[PDB]
Amino acid sequence: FTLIELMIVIAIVGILAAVALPAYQDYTARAQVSEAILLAEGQKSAVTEYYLNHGKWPENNTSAGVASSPTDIKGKYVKEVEVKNGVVTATMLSSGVNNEIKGKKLSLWARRENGSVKWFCGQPVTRTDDDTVADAKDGKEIDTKHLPSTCRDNFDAK
Template identity: 55%
Template structure:
């Protein structure tokens, strides 16, 4: 008699079930990682704008009100960023990063400066619904 070799149907079904469970866990984690990587592009553009705003303030002790006054292009955009805008809120400049809808629809990150003793520190805020996509300092 010949000895049977190979996998039984039950063994193959168990392997398929295990792969399905692993995929159910891995795919959402990967999607979150992809969005966070896209948000990182916007934070890089924001760093450029924050540096310009800080230099403007330290040179003249006033805040710039537009991208142009901060020495930035009117449209500062990238693959996942629709624009980075310098504006004024409550007498202080803000840097607002607007993301394309391909990243997360409605996601904006706002950086607000605090000047103290010849230095400028920045705080970050975003809507709580998007907290999982931004650095912990923005919560």
């Protein structure tokens, strides 16, 4: 006979949350990744200096002169950050993150410019030789959709 204004408006806010759910869920993940990136960076300094001073990429965190323990460079969404031959990889925690990005990671690696180096940011990579890296293809890479426009670099970016 009457009361449908309360019933529809409680059910439009319910469906509004369902539509606002995936937007906040990638905005959210995309936000948790943007930090793995910040934790990865700022460690470029150590790595850059080590390379320019010696001409060899730092083998591990201790070589680079950073928390000798990968797990000591963690965060809220970051379970750690390891330096492996100049390549700095950031791992996403398992608690406090999206759902399709946890335990997932990215990498920052550089290239000899000769007198200086240039840095790249993208999906996990392994270093082959002092001037070549390759996709750490394995299935734990953070999905392209979660990576900034500034971190879409490919293993062979120059």
